[PDB]
Amino acid sequence: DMEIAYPITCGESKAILLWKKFVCPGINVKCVKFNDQLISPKHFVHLAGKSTLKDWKRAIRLGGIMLRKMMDSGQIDFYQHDKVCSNTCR
Ligand SMILES: [Zn+2]
């Protein structure tokens, strides 16, 4: 079908989050398309220059809002988070 996704940013860098690939705990999961390469949020954040924050969920933004908040709202949280979790996402 279609690849559900969301446009995201980090610093002045733009990328695309493939939502169904966004699986807990997300940090090292290849779910971000950046320059036609599928990479992890940790790598995207590093390349965007925000690794010094030590909080990828706050470094990445969706519509200007910290990804952390969109995740906490339940509207854009990890795919199938209620059943698939590492217990280290918090
Ligand atoms: Zn989790």
Which residues neighbour ligand 1 (ion) by CB within 5 Å? Answer: 24, 85, 89
| Resolution of the entry in angstroms | 1.5
How many domains, in total, are found in the chain? 1
Method: X-ray
**Dihedral in degrees, nearest 10, Cα atoms 52, 74, 28, 5:** -100
Cα–ligand 1 centroid distance for 84 (angstroms): 7
Pair 24, 85: CB distance under 8 Å? yes
68 annotated to bind ligand: yes
Strand order in the sheet with 13-18: 37-39, 32-34, 13-18, 5-10, 61-62, 65-66
Domain range holding 42? 1-90
- For residue 6, the domain's CATH number is 3.10.390.10
Cα–ligand 1 centroid distance for 77 (angstroms): 9
Cα of 34 vs its chain's centroid, Å: 12
User: In 3D, which of 20, 14, 8 has the Cα closest to residue 80?
Assistant: 20
50 annotated to bind ligand: yes
Cα–ligand 1 centroid distance for 49 (angstroms): 25
Write out the chain in H/E/C secondary structure: CCCCEEEEEECCEEEEEEHHHCCCCCCCCCCEEECCEEECHHHHHHHCCCHHHCCHHHHCEECCEEHHHHHHCCCCCCCCCCCCCCCCCC
Q: What are phi and psi of 65, to 5 degrees?
A: -95, 135
CA distance 63 to 47: 20
